[PDB]
């Protein structure tokens with residue numbers, strides 16, 4: 001019942017929700033690492049120094065890599081920030097990031113004390 005454990009449970013619930021069918025219509029571009037070569041995005045790794053995606057957040061949670069909620073939240077926000085950095089703000093993927101980040105921020109704010 002440690003505070004860090006309990007907050008990490010809330011983080012894991014958020015993570016499960018972001019990966020759930022409820023949000024699938026807009027969450028899917030964040031499921032796997034951006035495959036820059038496959039998508040023809042040959043500048044992606046010159047612009048984004050620290051790629052992040054929900055499969056990587058899941059592997060790090062399963063590995064007990066995150067020591068607290070703050071470390072978890074940093075990777076999820078790195079994923080969104082990467083999207084806002086690389087993409088013109090009017091691109092479909094940006095609208096999808098905005099929507100999924102709204103899901104994230106509102107539930108992250110319900111963190112237990």
Ligand SMILES: COCC(COC)n1c(-c2cc(C)c(=O)n(C)c2)nc2cc(N3CCOCC3)ccc21
Nearest residue numbers: 029030034035039040041082083086087092093096
């Ligand atoms: C809505 O996203 C559109 C972009 C298009 O990039 C060229 N996109 C990204 C993508 C995502 C992010 C976060 C980003 O910043 N960029 C630039 C592209 N990842 C993708 C993966 C796929 N597929 C098709 C379905 O099976 C899986 C592979 C298809 C499109 C994708």
